[PDB]
Amino acid sequence: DALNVPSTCCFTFSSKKISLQRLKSYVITTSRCPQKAVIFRTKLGKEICADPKEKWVQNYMKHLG
């Protein structure tokens, strides 16, 4: 027996294209989420939901690695 903890999912995608300079990293949401999403983490710690299909999101993922 163990404690289990929550998962992070995106159900809406950001409509603002944030400056790439604010960003530290990205992750793709757990496969358990109903929809695939990118979560960007900013250098100040904010998490931003973004649509994996959008050109800007893809370009940012390429820059971030």
Give me the least distance between CB of 4 and a copy of itself, in Å please: 4
SS3 22: helix
Q: Which residues contact 34 (CB under 8 A, 6 or more apart)?
A: 9, 11
Give me the least distance between CB of 18 and a copy of itself, in Å please: 6
Size of the site for a copy of itself (CB under 8 A): 28
Tell me: does residue 55 bind a copy of itself (CB under 8 A): no
Give me the least distance between CB of 17 and a copy of itself, in Å please: 8
* CA of residue 48 relative to chain centroid, distance: 6
